[PDB]
Design a protein around this ligand. Structure first.
Ligand SMILES: N[C@@H](Cc1ccc(O)cc1)C(=O)O
Ligand SMILES: N[C@@H](Cc1ccc(O)cc1)C(=O)O
Lengths: 317, 317
């Protein structure tokens, strides 16, 4: 209602399976929602932040978030938003990386809350022990190849080429939504822009097995210059302070272009509309001051690294 | 060489992956070959006989046959030669049916031979315990969706429709050839006409995992009238004497049309070329005698049911 209208205002709603339906439910009950994160490195990056903080916002409005670590799916690989087939990492690598990500994930959510404390879960727990026969019949019977070929993730790759491995990924994620729906009462799955197909596939699986759940995607973070958000000369802006120091993290944000700063305050910050509007006017009236830019950098560095880390960054600068 | 040339003469060779290569090998070594049979009923039928007796012929020429019972694949279902999606049978049903088929299979092969005794195997043994993750990475990485969509079995169905379940079947069979190749030295896989795609998929898997094996398909048994071989008014001609009695089995064959009889003697019998030619001339010179027709019926009933069963059939007639 207001949560959804605020998200909209901020620009965090790219698509929704049924907006009136979802608004309705959000307003009547504590909603269990989840977001998936696959270990494709030993650290999350700012590419994951919008999804992460959106979870947070759902928590603050009294909803229950589950952050899903992709122990199983990180072993297959999501073709979504990828132009090329990816290399398979080893169980050992994925296993190690999952442990870390779980750690960064925990920072942004509340586990002490009573009524809506978060849960962090690993899909290896239920995909790990599943036999192929069970999977091909219990999940696979529900999907036609024609339904799947049409998916943006796949359509985007059959000439380019795609192994059966990645083509099957959507089933796995489809299955995660069903398990979570059943064992945790999860009625909403959220994700970046590229996840629409995987989300709706989970909804198709639910619908077809139960005959009630919704999906929301966050839009791709844009730049006015038309370059790749997070694409620095430095390489990725990690959330691991040993890969990207707090000072570097802080400088990345401080260097936001005047053109982007207001979209970024709305996306990554917990500042009100009224604080954000005010900074817009100050951005207009005194743009050499860089008030919106320092506000962003302080807010986001604090979020990710905390105050002492912030304090260091500022004094180092 | 002569085995292959005889098969050819008989009309049991529809296609072969590399004829000179296969001829060569057959002539230089004892070849391990296999044929797959899926429990889709509680009995095999005359639809399976050509494949079965061809195995036999490979055994007689000194080769080693493995008859594979589809305990795992019978749980998925082969779209090959099927215009419609099939219903999934239960583990319990399939499990029960496998036990019977193993029994009928054993009748046509030699287990006492030293050097080339047969083996009967159940693919549930290695597919049963395989986890999805292992299957999607170890088998799936090797296949592009484009390779698979082109397969006659699948091409024939995407508008018609095909679940992912049946679309994946070929991987499973692909995997059987690899396991058998590795654990039994199996270098040749044979099957009916409709199996070419599944066979070549197993060859693609072998090639891509090892970088040596061949495939042979038997042609669809034809009728001069253009009707469906085995399609009786009675319903299927089973190999189970409790479903189709020896007398009925015998009558089916005795009723072979003059037009088909010589193709059937060549396909289903162990009569020489010279005996078969002779019957051709007798078919020409005295067709009301029905010499070719009784020869067929006696030969095939004996094969499937034995002499006493034959004796009954004749005296009952
Ligand atoms: N598809 C998400 C991760 C994910 C994994 C499992 C899920 O159930 C959901 C999402 C990504 O690649 O970023
Ligand atoms: N595809 C064969 C059966 C089969 C099963 C497993 C195999 O490995 C090979 C063949 C059929 O449907 O008749």
């Amino acid at each position: 209602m207001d949560l959804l209208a605020e998200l909209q205002w901020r620009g965090l709603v790219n698509q929704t399976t049924d907006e009136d339906g979802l608004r309705k439910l959000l307003n009547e009950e504590r909603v269990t929602l989840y977001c998936g994160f696959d270990p494709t490195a030993d650290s999350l990056h700012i590419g994951h932040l919008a999804a992460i903080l959106t979870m947070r916002r759902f928590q603050q409005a009294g909803h229950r978030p589950i952050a899903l670590v992709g122990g199983a799916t990180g072993l297959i690989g999501d073709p979504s938003g990828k132009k090329s087939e990816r290399t398979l990492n080893a169980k050992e690598t994925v296993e190690a990386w999952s442990a870390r990500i779980k750690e960064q994930l925990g920072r942004f959510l509340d586990f002490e809350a009573d009524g809506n404390p978060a849960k962090i879960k690993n899909n290896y727990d239920w995909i790990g022990p599943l036999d192929v026969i069970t999977f091909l019949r219990d999940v696979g019977k529900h999907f036609s190849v024609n339904y799947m070929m049409a998916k943006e993730s796949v359509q985007s790759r059959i000439e380019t080429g795609i192994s059966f491995t990645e083509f099957s990924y959507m089933m796995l994620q489809a299955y995660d939504f069903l398990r979570l729906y059943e064992t945790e009462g999860c009625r909403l799955q959220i994700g970046g822009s590229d996840q629409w197909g995987n989300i709706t596939a989970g909804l198709e699986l639910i619908r077809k097995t139960k005959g009630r759940a919704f999906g929301l995607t966050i839009p791709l973070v844009t730049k006015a210059d038309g370059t790749k958000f997070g694409k620095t000369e430095s390489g990725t802006i990690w959330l691991d302070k040993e890969k990207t120091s707090p000072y570097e993290f802080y400088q990345f944000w401080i260097n936001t272009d005047d053109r982007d700063v207001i979209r970024y305050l709305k996306y990554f910050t917990f500042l009100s509309k009224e604080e954000i509007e005010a900074l817009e006017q100050e951005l207009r009236e005194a743009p050499e001051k860089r008030a919106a830019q320092k506000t962003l950098a302080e807010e986001v560095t604090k979020l990710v690294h905390g105050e002492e880390a912030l304090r260091q960054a500022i004094r180092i600068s």
